[PDB]
Design a binder for this molecule. Structure first.
Ligand code: FAD
Ligand code: FAD
Ligand code: ADX
Ligand code: ADX
Ligand code: SF4
Ligand code: SF4
Ligand code: SF4
Ligand code: SF4
Lengths: 642, 149, 642, 149
């Protein structure tokens, strides 16, 4: 709910337009975006190309890494700088298995061979990495390393700023729509946005556009609906902006049905990775049973995935879900037994791991430490409750939802190149439009290091694309004016109908962003496998979801906004609704349950490798208002065995 | 969610920018020109990331756990320096914990993005190599991956 | 969420106290309350007794019957005025079986032998009852008759007003606590409250007090959490005030674990009684399966409950839950097939029943008609979705939670009289304190007519009590002063700590009413068998609920209020919190699952007639702050067999 | 929830009391002394019972379905008389339905609470009979119920 102190209304025609011409436009200054800005700046010199980074907030702390992070979840270690060395083949296998068999290995192997370089630079830049007395990076699990990352984003933000120059970074500018080439229907030409600090409409003309807006949160109703509606596990700052503008532009999406349900400390959603992998904490149900043991057998039906190591995340979630359905909650993270076991009676040793335990939280999810403080929970004395949160849609973490993108020429198989007019690394099916981080699908487990890295990859490809294809996109001025009118329409609608009611938020001719959001969340929660149905859905529910989303979409044309802040909220809602529809259509399309633990199709309860071991890709045609789906069979690109 | 302390707040004296309003990743912190004091304009959209708290004149901003699940009394207070950050965690029951973690091993604003990197070349633009590679990867050569036979 | 327009703050010492002396005090002017006022006025003449009615809102529309009602759910018909005559023994059997074997039959038979007289008076006073061409009251089901009841409450309000006199009715006065006899720890002496329209503290001194505050809603998080958090199926106006004040005084509660989960049209919660019983509507899952038939086998284990006709309400719910757990939603009410079948091809007949269908909604839950209109649902063309709502605590409807009350001398068995110091009809275990309507437990299915009737019964008993025992309780001025200070404490706390934050609703030293309610709702939803777990719970979850409720109860001492409206909301929260604790403790005490469909104890999943065919009664001792429970074996009082 | 139309509202300045503020069972309707126009002070606590709409200057108050599940466009408008009530139901798609139901068969304020009832007596006070019984029940004798042997 939002109650502005005072109005801040502007009519489209009263708003000044600022035109910005550049060559490479990066939308989103988070980790993937900064990675693109950094790398783009390096190669751009080859042609004196102008690189521009636009961010809706402030790059110093914007995005998922606002609080910092406690570890770098992706570090292969090909030389032995850490406590454990790994191979690229083992990493690719690990990711494909975690995805229950579906991952674009050309994309995963590609960021995996580059990721370590990025991490080494981060350290060179000042990021403090936990080290053993011997000087080795401290491993959390097999693929992660611990870090003192409270200033993780600020550091990366500095690198990007030093790379592209502050004069090429536009902050507090919300991008709401992409612009296409007047000359070509399947080529990008820039984007439009508006300031959230003053009345100013922006028109960015560019030769290449890179989507780095992060994923989408708040599409589903959370387990806390009051103030805590803001405590989303994933970045509440990311609202599927990239998904919206790209799909509207006609860029194809892939695996959009693959949402991620995080199992985390209950309510605060503090991290469990360090607790599970580093502190060796056990999770047990209300009766003291370690369910990863008692529920092992149930994974036998998921051969061979059910035998991988580690066990696929969705399957671990599935075991949790079974406990929940049987009514064996609360589920506890026995931190008290983990700390005692690790300290072995040594009080000084206990103090040390106790500090590491709190840092794990204070370095990235302070709310969890605050939760323990408010509830008087001392981790060395009592366990903490854990629970799965509502669904989130993203492609950098454990979820692989995002745009179908092209891979490197040396790894991408012919099978995966068919839908791309131009073969450039990380480019979407729309020419000149790239997608990175959460915006790029089918290659998850990128996390901080991997997302920054994927940004670098697309950045170089964008420079190469510009110098090789030499595009000269022209924006349609008629479309631009239409979008400018749409941009502030919510404010004009408010002024035009607020007199119908003595209460600004109870009007028959419009809905405010928070009202439309509450509605979206309820629809998704009740019909799209949200927490309400313990992540279960079926054809009929999904079909009803589409009917309700259709009503909501029509009502978006009657959205209102009382100030610039709420105008941004209005467009973030619009982005979420379309993202939600795509998610529903994708879940409806795939007739199987490949990721139990993430969602269940009760009408198609089994995993089907005979007919569904394929990526589901879709395209939305704005002109025809039609969604088309296609199945791309998975092919093993890298050598590895179960 | 975050909240500003009136007594300590001074709406950002004569500085050039409002720290809190400048840092918030969700555009929540703003100023009430009348009182000349800041406030969170939409608390149910606060992620409790503590960015505002860390970047303001110490004590001007604090966080009060979401009411949905937070009994009153808890507080986490950060003191962010240049090389490390100090934290004080106060429990509802009076318990007080103190921690200090490193946050950076180099001076702020000291990053040289392409330090030691050779200049880019049109030729290199056509390979898989990113800036600084394969050297920065630490390997004897660009990492090779076995393709599926 | 609440955002007051402007402050309305007062300090206890600056608020004038108005003392009101009376003989019989009725708290709450709803259906049971008006029934008591009506009957009290009649018998009071015998001793020139003064009767006082206090209502927090306006009697004309206050309570559950604010919108009107579409039927009178309890009309036995012992002479044939309706389409179907019934016997009192058959009714008592019906209620006991619906309660899965547990009901105070002396209490049920008692209101049942009186109820028809109340209904006849209702018609005589102007209530239009549907009639057949032959002049018989139109039967909905076996026990209900259809009425044109849009003005049901205004009519009953007029009757009560004409009886007791307007000068004896205090509206817009919120009672928040009872007063006990200075010189007797188990006798009532009055009550305290405050005006919500002006600064005025009320002290009611009385010889007999009748709790008629209605039940409790909003203890659990609803299926809608934004504006629709206001769309509770049961009266959002009733917040367990009677439960709170009575239990604090030491009056024993009974069957407080027996909540009611209404299965209703989804979201709007429109009625299904007429649709099921009158229109013969069928409920089917997403695959056209009529679950009452497909899930018949699952009811065979309950003996003889599962073979009863009609099937007990909780069991009908249980069949619905099985479908929900299996993920076979949406569940549909096929109104389209029901209307077509009843019309039999007769277009004029169709139009007639179509108008009847809409009246069923417009006379009692307009929101459902509005929902259909907003969603373009035409009942003659498409089915509507149905779903069970969150739990509500009340004793007049299908739930029997409330106070353990004494029955009539001619029906109450010795087994049920042991806990009452004085044997007066509907008197609680606290001398001089009566409970009616939602406030009287163990005798459900009263509804409108039955609640009004129970009020009449308690009213006559209250006069008999006063004339026979000649009570003369003395209030404690010291306690009155302490309570007056507590009454306005929230306002004072707000003034005292508001300066700690630049935002009124984000303070570290206090919680506002809506903030404490959100917290209560989440606790109950997640741990006390709310919708979050499909109404399932266990000992561990319930114990955790008590721990969280303890934190909240302690925080109630730090409640803040910005105006009179919010001060009332503050006490309404206080009332709900204690009601919730009582509910949790009761569910924790009963080690069985007697009402699957209402709630499931996964740790004690079976119904146990060997050791749990008893009423669970508890007492809270404020002085010791201790709860004590005891089992009172059920005894069949009325002659009937399965 | 309910909302007031600025054009129709007049703050009941020509009446002895404010209808909406007087009738609302949840104390939501109040007056903004400034505009002298009513408003719903806490819409998420509105039961959509239509009491305010019915007892108000016919076109001043209306209801806009809760945003959680209500698409825009729908409306239910009542016209309450003395013996009947008229309803118009307007669908989002433009469909318009009209209904009329009776609400009372006697003149308002005409109830004589104990009409025909004999005076109460101390002897009667000790019985199970309520006012008007047993005849109001429809039987010459008080209804009997068989107790189990
Ligand atoms: C609570 C939490 C814990 C995590 N823990 C770990 C960990 O320990 N280790 C690890 O390696 N990884 C971790 N990650 C993962 C990691 O942070 C991501 O993988 C990574 O940040 C994704 O980068 P992004 O670029 O795709 O998204 P982000 O970094 O979120 O960036 C997106 C940017 O786009 C902006 N933006 C959005 N929409 C628009 C618009 N319309 N116009 C302009 N700008 C816009 C945002 O404001 C933000 O600056 C975690 C994430 C969260 C949320
Ligand atoms: C949507 C819905 C549909 C229903 N449909 C039917 C039907 O078709 N037929 C039928 O017969 N029955 C029906 N009932 C049931 C029926 O309305 C009840 O059984 C009956 O109203 C209960 O009466 P009560 O006296 O216990 O509670 P209510 O009638 O609710 O009265 C409680 C009173 O106490 C007041 N109050 C509360 N707290 C305080 C306080 N602290 N101080 C002062 N006053 C206070 C309230 O403002 C209200 O005036 C329905 C109920 C609802 C909510
Ligand atoms: N039980 C587990 N077994 C194996 N890996 C786990 C387990 N829990 C977490 N992980 C891994 O540890 C990382 C996740 O850490 P978390 O603390 O849970 O939160 S995250 O925000 O950093 O993703 C990922 O690399 C994930 O694969
Ligand atoms: N399926 C059913 N079988 C038997 N009785 C039912 C059924 N459904 C509803 N009832 C009865 O009809 C009445 C309830 O009506 P509803 O329309 O569901 O809502 S209520 O608000 O009036 O209680 C009660 O008498 C209840 O016992
Ligand atoms: S919060 Fe701190 S930074 Fe913001 S205006 Fe107040 S003093 Fe300045
Ligand atoms: S804690 Fe973070 S999200 Fe909340 S107001 Fe401050 S900076 Fe913004
Ligand atoms: S709504 Fe109607 S009753 Fe209320 S103040 Fe306005 S005119 Fe008067
Ligand atoms: S509809 Fe009912 S609850 Fe809502 S304001 Fe009007 S009278 Fe109050």
């Amino acid at each position: 709910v939002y109650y502005p102190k005072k109005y801040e209304l502007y009519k489209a025609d009263e708003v000044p337009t600022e035109v910005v011409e550049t060559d490479i436009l990066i939308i989103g200054g988070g980790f993937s975006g900064c990675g693109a800005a950094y790398e783009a700046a390096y190669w751009a010199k080859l042609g004196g190309l102008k690189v521009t980074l636009v961010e809706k907030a402030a790059v110093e702390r914007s995005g998922a890494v606002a609080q910092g992070l406690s570890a770098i979840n992706t570090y292969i270690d090909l030389t032995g700088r850490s406590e454990r060395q790994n191979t690229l083949e083992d990493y690719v296998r690990y990711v494909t298995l975690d995805m229950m068999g579906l991952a674009r290995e050309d994309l995963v192997a590609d960021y995996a061979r580059h990721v370590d370089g990025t991490v080494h630079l981060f350290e060179k830049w000042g990021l403090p990495i936990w080290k053993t007395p011997d000087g080795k990076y401290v491993r959390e699990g097999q693929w992660q390393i611990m870090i003192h990352g409270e200033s993780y984003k600020p550091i990366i933000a500095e690198a990007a700023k030093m790379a592209v120059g502050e004069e090429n970074i536009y902050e507090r500018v919300f991008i709401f729509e992409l612009l296409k080439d007047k000359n070509d229907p399947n080529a990008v030409a820039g984007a439009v946005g508006f300031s959230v600090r003053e009345p100013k409409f922006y028109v960015f003309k560019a030769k290449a556009v890179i989507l780095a807006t992060g994923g989408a949160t708040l599409l589903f109703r959370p387990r806390s609906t009051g103030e805590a509606a803001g405590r989303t596990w994933y970045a509440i700052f990311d609202t599927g902006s990239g998904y919206y503008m790209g799909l509207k532009a006609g860029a194809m999406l892939t695996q959009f049905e693959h949402r991620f349900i995080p199992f985390r400390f209950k309510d605060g959603y503090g991290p469990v990775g360090a607790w599970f992998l580093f502190f060796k904490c056990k999770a047990k149900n209300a009766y003291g049973e370690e369910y990863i043991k008692t529920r092992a057998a149930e994974l036998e039906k998921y051969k061979p995935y059910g035998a991988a190591q580690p066990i696929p995340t969705p399957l671990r979630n599935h075991q949790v879900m079974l406990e929940i359905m049987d009514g064996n909650q609360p589920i506890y993270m026995h931190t008290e037994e983990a700390l005692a076991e690790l300290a072995g009676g040594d009080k000084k040793k206990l103090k040390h791991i106790y500090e590491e335990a709190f840092e794990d939280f204070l370095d990235m999810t302070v709310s969890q430490a605050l939760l323990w403080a408010c509830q008087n929970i001392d981790p060395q004395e009592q366990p903490s409750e854990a629970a799965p949160a509502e669904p989130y849609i993203m492609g950098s973490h454990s979820g692989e939802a995002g745009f179908w993108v092209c891979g490197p020429e040396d790894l991408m198989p012919e099978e995966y190149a068919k839908l791309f007019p131009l073969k450039y690394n990380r480019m979407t099916t729309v020419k000149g439009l790239f997608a990175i981080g959460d915006c790029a699908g089918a290659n998850p487990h990128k996390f901080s290091s991997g997302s920054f890295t994927e940004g670098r990859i697309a950045a170089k490809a964008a420079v190469r694309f510009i110098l090789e294809q030499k595009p000269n996109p022209e924006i349609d001025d008629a479309v631009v004016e239409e979008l400018k009118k749409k941009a502030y329409a919510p404010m004009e609608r408010f002024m035009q109908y607020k007199d119908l009611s003595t209460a600004d938020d109870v009007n028959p001719e419009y809905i405010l962003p928070w009202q439309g959001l509450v509605r979206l969340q309820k629809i998704m929660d009740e019909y799209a496998a949200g927490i309400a149905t313990i992540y279960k859905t079926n054809e009929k529910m999904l079909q009803r979801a589409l009917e309700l989303l259709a009503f909501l979409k029509e009502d978006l044309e009657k959205l209102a906004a009382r100030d610039l802040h709420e105008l941004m909220r209005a467009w973030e809602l619009v982005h979420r609704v379309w993202t939600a529809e795509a998610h529903v259509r994708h879940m409806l399309f795939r007739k199987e349950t490949r990721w139990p633990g993430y969602y269940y199709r009760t009408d198609y309860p089994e995993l089907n490798d005979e007919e569904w071991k394929c990526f589901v890709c879709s395209k939305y045609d704005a002109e025809k208002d039609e969604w088309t789906f296609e199945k791309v069979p998975y092919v093993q690109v890298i050598e590895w065995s179960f | 969610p975050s909240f500003v302390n009136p007594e300590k707040c001074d709406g950002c004296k004569a500085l050039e920018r409002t720290a809190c309003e400048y840092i918030c990743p969700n555009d929540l912190m703003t100023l009430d020109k009348e009182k000349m004091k800041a406030y969170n304009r939409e608390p149910d959209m606060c992620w409790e990331c503590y960015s505002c708290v860390k970047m303001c004149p110490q004590g001007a901003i604090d966080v009060r756990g979401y009411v949905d699940y937070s009994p009153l009394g808890g507080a986490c207070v950060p003191m962010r320096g240049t090389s490390d950050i100090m934290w004080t965690v106060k429990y509802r029951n009076g318990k007080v914990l103190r921690f200090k973690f490193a946050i950076r091993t180099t001076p702020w604003g000291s990053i040289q993005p392409f330090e030691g990197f050779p200049e880019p070349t049109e030729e290199a633009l056509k390979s898989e190599l990113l800036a600084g590679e394969p050297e920065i990867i630490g390997t004897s050569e660009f990492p090779q991956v076995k393709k599926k036979a």
